[PDB]
Design a protein around this ligand. Structure first.
Ligand SMILES: CCCCCCCCNc1nc2c(N)ncnc2n1[C@@H]1O[C@H](COP(=O)(O)OP(=O)(O)OC[C@H]2[NH2+]C[C@H](O)[C@@H]2O)[C@@H](O)[C@H]1O
Length: 507
């Protein structure tokens, strides 16, 4: 049994070498840029634009902690002044940090549990580690947090439902915002019964501090690795966050495009072995999943090792069936082993990725959320197959870019862990989406050698027989009709790939 099958990975397209020449970075109606584009220079910390803080406190922008409209009933007082007073105290014990955060979150005094924070500090860290945390890391995090109005001078628009919009901000700007999120300073993002931001993911880090899960220390180690690095030396690059909503979806049954190339392998991971490729994040509709709470699978691990991803939660509304989020430029700061209960922070990572002409690391991640299936047969219903095709296709498609300038898609068992999908069906769905979007596929089966062989055999069978995307989708519709629709038992009598082979061969 070979470690990989299909097209050699060397034959696949990769960034930035496959990339078209970037246009000049400029703000426009569909592109927010929070730095001085005229002053952007390699190895220099970007200058925020505008020079001085400008506030927008409304339903289309982020509500900044430093806003003069961020008030707290005392008579109205200034929450930002309160944050400053609370955080500029010295911490020598974890209760100090609890008490600090709670001074400007009084309504949550009884609801927010800090057991994981207290245990990390007192019961996991060695004396010298804790001392480095409270004497150096935390005070530095406080200072970049409180620099917010000097760093994030431009209002940040919400990437709201149905918007086709990008935000390009500096890694420094992201570091300052994430320090705020750590100290739980973002207003209107806390109430269980909130309305305005009920359609947005959590941003404040309070649920990282609750409970006694053995994985919280590992999450905190991964994040403090990030925070120690970005507060000790300011990062110099940019990161772009793009919401993409597609209106026109293919008529899959009539699609005449042929399948594209496949490399499939049971070794390697998306994040290590997909350099220069469109990397898939197996997302929740609320991007980043439980990264700021208990979650610790594929999405949350990526969000932790590349923490600049987390800030997407500040401004990215829940994804609808036709939408995705594309993040370009995030930097890897940590290495890890395992997942969930076996997840461990391994060590600090020195990202060696090149930067593009906008000083973004050459790393493009798309968050596409699969459906969470409670019953196995649910996923074969045509509207659910069509839904998955269209989600993957929106994630893969780059309107107005030629195929020769599209990197391969680096993906894997999307939706087939926590979300209960079938890997063989999802693989074919992704192969069809990629084909329609004119991209090759690099599939990581994550240890499953038999799945690698099965995907390869099917793809080569379909390719050799010259079946189009439409031809293959029609075969999915036949499997649903003959084996799933009138099936009363929990599983179908015949499996999908055997069915396809028999259906094609016998005609
Ligand atoms: C193989 C079965 C057990 C492994 C589970 C470990 C979690 C990580 N999975 C993972 N990391 C990968 C990587 N580095 N490169 C390539 N493939 C990777 N995988 C594979 O992906 C499958 C699905 O992972 P999962 O995270 O459960 O994805 P979804 O089923 O889409 O779950 C979505 C929800 N999870 C959190 C997110 O926010 C959503 O709420 C896994 O089985 C595993 O083969």
């Amino acid at each position: 049994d070979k470690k990989w099958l299909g097209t050699p990975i060397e034959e696949m397209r990769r960034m930035p070498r496959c990339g078209i020449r970037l246009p000049l970075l400029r703000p426009s109606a569909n592109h927010t840029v929070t730095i001085r584009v005229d002053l952007l220079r390699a190895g220099e910390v970007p200058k925020p634009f505008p020079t001085h803080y400008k506030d927008l406190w409304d339903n289309k922008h982020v509500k900044m902690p430093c806003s003069e409209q961020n008030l707290y009933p005392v008579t109205a007082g200034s929450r930002w002044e309160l944050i400053q007073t609370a955080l500029l105290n010295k911490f020598t014990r974890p209760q100090n940090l609890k008490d600090a955060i709670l001074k400007y979150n009084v309504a949550y005094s009884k609801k927010w549990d800090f057991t994981a924070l207290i245990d990390f500090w007192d019961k996991v860290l060695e004396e010298a580690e804790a001392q480095h945390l409270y004497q150096s890391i935390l005070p530095d995090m406080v200072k970049i947090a409180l620099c917010l109005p000097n760093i994030c001078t431009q209002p940040i628009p919400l990437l709201a439902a149905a918007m086709n919009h990008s935000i390009t901000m500096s890694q420094e700007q992201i570091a300052s915002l994430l320090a705020n999120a750590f100290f739980c300073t973002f207003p209107r993002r806390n109430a269980k019964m909130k309305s305005e931001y009920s359609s947005y993911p959590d941003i404040n880090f309070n649920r990282l501090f609750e409970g006694r899960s053995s994985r919280k220390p590992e999450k905190l180690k991964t994040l403090f690795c990030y925070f120690r690095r970005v507060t000790a030396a300011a990062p110099t690059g940019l990161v772009t966050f793009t919401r993409q909503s597609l209106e026109d979806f293919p008529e899959w049954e009539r699609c005449e495009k042929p399948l594209t190339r496949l490399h499939v392998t049971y070794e390697g991971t998306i994040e290590e072995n997909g350099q220069g490729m469109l990397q898939v994040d197996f997302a929740n509709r609320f991007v980043g999943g439980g990264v700021t709470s208990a979650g610790l699978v594929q999405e949350e691990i990526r969000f932790l090792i590349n923490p600049e991803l987390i800030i997407s939660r500040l401004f990215t509304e829940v994804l609808d069936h036709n939408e995705c989020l594309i993040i370009t430029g995030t930097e890897q700061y940590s290495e890890y082993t395992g997942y969930a209960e076996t997840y461990r922070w391994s060590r600090s990572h020195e990202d060696g990725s090149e930067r593009d002409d906008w000083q973004r690391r050459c790393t493009e991640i798309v968050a596409i959320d699969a459906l969470h299936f409670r019953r196995y047969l649910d996923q074969f219903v045509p509207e659910k197959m069509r839904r998955e095709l269209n989600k993957a296709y929106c994630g893969f498609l780059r309107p107005g870019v030629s195929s020769e300038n599209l990197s391969a898609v680096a993906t894997g068992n999307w939706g087939c862990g926590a979300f209960g999908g079938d890997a063989r069906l999802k693989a074919l769905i992704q192969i069809l989406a990629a084909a329609a979007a004119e991209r090759d596929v690099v599939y990581f089966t994550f240890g499953d050698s038999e799945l690698m062989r099965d995907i390869y055999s099917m793809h080569i069978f379909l390719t050799e027989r010259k079946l189009t995307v439409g031809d293959v989708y029609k075969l999915l519709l036949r499997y649903y009709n003959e084996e799933c629709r009138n099936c009363s038992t929990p599983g179908p009598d015949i499996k999908l790939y055997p069915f396809i082979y028999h259906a094609v061969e016998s005609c």
